[PDB]
Subunit: 124 residues, 4 copies
């Protein structure tokens, strides 16, 4: 993948969360997520996909991934998906927007989903 | 997984798209997605996660998945993530909201991401 | 306004909420919103804007509006904005997506904002 | 309004856009918006609402507003709604997420709506 090397490794967001990812030659994203906030402790499994053959016109590299907030420690009955783009270079970034859906009753389903935005960098 | 059997199989959304998914005992989602709309043809790899031990209080089952819109036929330099919940029973549903991010230049990054909502059923 | 007559009046969404709106010749939306759900009772002031000169090519009419969830009965320290389009005809609809932001501390700001989708019709 | 004085005035976002707003004692927002980006030129009318009696616990002030992208110069057949919170103090901010809906045909309605985030400050 063009950005396999660029994407693979450890990222930090503005909240102090840790995203550890391996990008596969085939478009796979695999790794672990550790949230600094919310009903979460330690690492959670993540999986996702990225564009392994992006445009060569200076566009970013589209990608996304999912965490279900269940591990051996806690279950927050929720899942977050991050949708965004990898921008390479000296200050590489992954700029994302995310949706967090909780399991709810039908009565509360209107309030099931949060939306936010996270920016990941290789330092901090 | 409590809804492993309920989630695994073929789903159809309101657009006529086809979502074919296997839920793993461990929270994994693996399969293929075929979009009826947009810059897409044939099947794309998807991966995601679901809550394999949901609440027993009648709440839905949180889940999410990603497609990168690259296959052997086309590359739309984009990725969609669906975030939502599985609601079991006679008329099982997956109710989602999604983010579609395109790879963009810095100049166009403000316009990178669409948001929408898809409802998947086992028929149609 | 091209859809001034079409938009002006009483609308109902899938939750049983009531949206009473007047569209001005100049693009203004003014009225009241009554939510069937959440921390809400009776009517709240709404204001917004619509495209008073839409495309003639069968496209819908872009529009949006805001409710701050404060009235003489309650204050939910939150505001919802609906963004969407009016689609005219026998079964007229306003198809929206919405963002609900709560006032939060800096610590909880990552969880400030819900996202959802409401469809309004002239009946039910 | 508790933050009537804090909110009223000229704001700038990260894109270089200009938001000029008056907050009314009653919860009204009225003003003009000038976008640095997209299919836009000069000022557009905006209207919205804010929580005129926010919590006294250090929480921000919920607010939202709408622009329909029609003025005497251009019509982009679209509307943006910003939903967010005002955070007072030495470096006052309005932290928003936004939905931009275009008028579309029914065929293209799945792609009608962009989502993004803007942060407004009193300088730059």
């Amino acid at each position: 993948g063009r950005d396999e090397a660029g994407i693979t490794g450890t990222w930090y967001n503005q909240l102090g969360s840790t995203f550890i990812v391996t990008a596969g030659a085939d478009g796979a994203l695999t790794g672990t997520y550790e949230s600094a906030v919310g009903n979460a402790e330690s690492r959670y499994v993540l999986t996702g996909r990225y564009d392994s053959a992006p445009a060569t016109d200076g566009s970013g590299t589209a990608l996304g991934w999912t965490v279900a907030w269940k591990n051996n420690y806690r279950n927050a009955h929720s899942a977050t998906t991050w949708s965004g783009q990898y921008v390479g270079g000296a200050e590489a970034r992954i700029n994302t927007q995310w949706l967090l859906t909780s399991g709810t009753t039908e009565a509360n389903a209107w309030a099931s989903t949060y939306v936010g935005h996270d920016t990941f960098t290789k330092v901090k």
